[PDB]
């Protein structure tokens, strides 16, 4: 897997791949690695497929219960901490998950939290999780800046996930893109790598290691 999330002037950009692997076997190329917890809360998935899917669906249940009890949208901090305390209850048991809770609330603004099965919980502006996190980190850091346009930031997330899908064997499939604004999250399409690679190679002029 390769998931990334970064916040900038225009909000939050979330970009994931879609490949699930059972070893060297490509189990799937069409895995939804973003859970839509609510109109203002997204969760990325990296690690055990079952662990991530199950516990983020459960996190969505917990956030719904919080809305019902407190008549208020749960904060990103509170949701990330719910998931963190849950996985820490299972620390050492063998859970493997690396998630990012991304959201906007009127209280804290736009917020990105990194949570993992280790129990680590970090607040940050840029995060890349998964086996291909280093590849995406390279491109993203080399082309990141706070005052990016929404178009430029969407394309930067897409290109970083593409670079990771290219170099990392266990990442690939299709880039799933999301833009989180003050009004909530907006889906920006599923872009298959099999065509996006050639499109970017032609328009950008990069990927000169490849024949084409």
């Amino acid at each position: 897997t390769t998931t990334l999330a970064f916040r900038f002037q225009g909000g939050i950009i979330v970009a994931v791949d879609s490949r699930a692997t059972a070893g060297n076997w490509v189990a799937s190329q069409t895995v939804k690695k973003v859970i839509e917890i609510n109109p203002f809360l997204l969760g990325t998935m990296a690690g055990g497929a079952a662990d991530c899917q199950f516990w983020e669906t459960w996190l969505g249940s917990q956030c719904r219960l919080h809305e019902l009890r407190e008549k208020e949208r749960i904060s990103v901090a509170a949701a990330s901490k719910i998931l963190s305390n849950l996985v820490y209850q299972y620390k050492g048991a063998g859970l493997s998950m690396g998630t990012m809770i991304c959201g906007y609330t009127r209280k804290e603004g736009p917020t990105i939290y990194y949570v993992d099965s280790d129990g680590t919980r970090l607040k940050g502006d840029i995060f890349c999780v998964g086996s291909g996190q280093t590849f995406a980190y390279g491109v993203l850091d080399s082309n990141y800046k706070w005052d990016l346009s929404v178009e430029d930031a969407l394309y930067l997330g897409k290109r970083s996930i593409l670079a990771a899908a290219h170099r990392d064997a266990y990442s690939g499939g299709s880039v799933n893109l999301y833009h989180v604004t003050e009004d909530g999250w907006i889906y920006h399409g599923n872009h298959d790598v099999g065509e996006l690679f050639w499109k970017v190679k032609e328009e950008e002029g990069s990927f000169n290691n490849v024949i084409g």
Partner: protein, 241 residues
């Protein structure tokens, strides 16, 4: 082991143990709470048997649940200690799991839930305690004043009193609290609170506690001399009206 149903229904639809807990609340010290435009004042009556009592070490009626939320009560003081401990633990737990202090309404609902649970569990009697919970929600300047009964009911109030002779104080408050114009200054709110207490407190000051709650975790208990200043102002203005 002991699970006998102590709080059960009567043929007229009453839970007599809860009503007797309300009776115990009626014989407790009087407590009053008044919402200002930007503050909440909690006043409390002390008993007149303070001859030889050590006011330095004796427990005060207004206990602080969190930096921003305070609680006063009426009834049996020991039950109040149990409730206050539970409320403080829950406030710290909410800080720990939500990374945000409790709202006054959430703390009130938790205390009321404990009290309700005690009217429904076998082998246990209800709390002989009613509470006034006051404060400001985190990052908010709107005052909050809530009241909980032994039954588990809780509700918000612009101003409210519980305890002995609280009907007189309630009539005074209903007469002299305008929803259109709440006490703007802190001084006006404290003045209204000490007046409400003086209607039933026949000893005057030194038998009055006053705690002011201002936003952003500002909580201050008035010394006896400031209360005496307010009481003397009330006595001077008493001849006027």
């Amino acid at each position: 082991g002991y699970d006998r149903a102590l709080s059960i229904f009567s043929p007229d639809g009453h839970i007599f143990q809860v009503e007797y807990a309300l009776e115990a609340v009626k014989r407790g010290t009087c407590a009053v709470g008044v919402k200002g435009k930007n503050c909440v004042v909690l006043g409390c009556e002390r008993r007149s048997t303070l001859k030889l009592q050590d006011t330095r070490i004796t427990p005060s009626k207004v206990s602080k649940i969190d930096s921003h939320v305070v609680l006063s009560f009426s009834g049996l003081n020991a039950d109040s200690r149990i409730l206050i401990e539970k409320a403080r633990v829950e406030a710290q737990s909410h800080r720990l799991t939500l990374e945000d202090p409790v709202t006054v309404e959430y703390l009130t609902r938790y205390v009321a839930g404990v009290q309700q649970r005690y009217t429904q569990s076998g082998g246990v009697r209800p709390f002989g305690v009613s509470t006034l919970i006051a404060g400001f929600d985190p990052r908010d300047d709107e005052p909050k004043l809530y009241q909980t009964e032994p039954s588990g009911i809780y509700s918000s109030w612009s101003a409210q009193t519980i305890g002995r002779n609280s009907k007189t104080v309630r009539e005074f408050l209903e007469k002299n609290y305008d929803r259109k114009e709440p006490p703007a200054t802190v001084e006006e709110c404290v003045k209204l609170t000490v007046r409400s207490l003086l209607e039933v407190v026949q000893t005057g000051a030194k038998n009055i506690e006053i705690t002011v709650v201002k936003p952003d975790s500002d909580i201050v208990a008035l010394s006896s001399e400031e209360i005496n200043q307010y009481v003397t102002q009330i006595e001077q203005e008493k001849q006027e009206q």
